[PDB]
């Protein structure tokens with residue numbers, strides 16, 4: 575009921591770490607090459623100067639909020655990482671010129687950490703494919719903050735660890751039991767002026783948490799189920815700091831290949847001799863239409879609106895997604911055309927044959943709600959606060975637009991479907 579935490583200044587700290595955090599590894603700067611250090615530190619600097627790191631206008635727990643920390647997702651080409659309901663797209667790295675050079679740097683840093691991890695994971699066990707898979711980092715999220723540009727920072731509420739740049743949380747959307755590697759770059763009770771990473775047992779508020787000091791060049795690893803059993807935070811220092819958190823993102827349903835295939839799957843129900851607006855369906859089996867409208871929603875809100883909300887962003891560091899994102903829109907547009915098709919069938923010249931109503935009604939109302947939601951987050955008050963960062967509500971078109979088969983809805987079509 576006093577608020578305490580532990581640091582290496584305490585006696586119990588070492589027995590707490592060894593007996594209650596055996597899966598938390600720390601490798602001090604003195605263990606990593608100076609050849610690697612300077613290179614990755616130079617990378618954080620070019621990328622920062624180039625303005626590739628932005629804070630995200632997230633909508634956590636129903637509220638629109640800008641994030642104190644600025645970040646950049648770098649990793650396998652075609653891969654994405656969902657973080658706080660927002661889906662970040664990877665600026666690609668050389669998976670078999672400055673911005674391109676840095677991604678090369680963070681690629682070797684990745685290989686490095688990967689090695690450090692499998693090793694430490696083997697030393698821990700004291701199959702071998704589980705180790706390999708759980709340390710196979712496919713992405714790295716880079717972060718940055720300060721110099722205290724924050725008017726007032728929130729104070730850690732449980733162990734008096736002082737100010738914090740990132741509150742207690744778990745790294746989510748990761749492969750089960752996957753490890754996480756962090757390279758900390760601090761460019762200059764716990765010492766207020768130094769960055770630390772906080773730790774605590776989930777649900778546990780009375781076991782003093784650990785605040786481990788982070789100096790320029792230090793790396794820490796979270797192995798096995800540690801990330802799931804414990805929460806961590808990042809207590810703030812006085813200087814600004816960078817960091818690259820390499821992870822193994824659960825990317826089933828999360829790569830360009832996956833979503834492209836999903837599209838080809840839905841369009842298998844449309845005569846594909848030519849690409850015009852006389853879209854005809856091979857069948858109106860309530861089940862196939864279900865899957866068709868579901869994929870329509872998936873490519874629309876999980877990919878298109880998600881990509882454009884970040885507005886002109888990754889484009890300042892990569893063009894990689896321009897054409898694939900242009901193709902998903904073409905694909906989606908064709909799907910708007912299948913919707914109109916189904917709509918023409920349902921209300922045309924049998925009547926139980928309206929299994930085509932209780933098979934697409936759920937997906938259409940969802941397309942309705944999610945469209946308002948996104949349109950709102952776009953022309954919202956907070957969203958007025960950079961020019962090249964402001965969210966875009968694409969795909970968007972005015973009711974008076976001829977090229978689109980249906981309107982941006984607003985219902986009427988949805989209401990009318992209640993009919994019966």
Ligand SMILES: Cc1cn([C@H]2C[C@H](O)[C@@H](CO)O2)c(=O)n(C)c1=O
Pocket residue numbers: 641643657658739740741743744745746747
């Ligand atoms: C769940 C979760 C949260 N945060 C950060 C976002 C903010 O910086 C802070 C509070 O949401 O935690 C984060 O960086 N990752 C990778 C997560 O998986």
Ligand SMILES: O=C(O)CNC(=O)C(=O)O
Pocket residue numbers: 715717740745756758771808817819
């Ligand atoms: O910077 C760190 O040490 C840890 N950062 C994070 O929590 C993160 O990137 O999600």
Ligand SMILES: [Fe+2]
Pocket residue numbers: 744745819
């Ligand atoms: Fe984290």
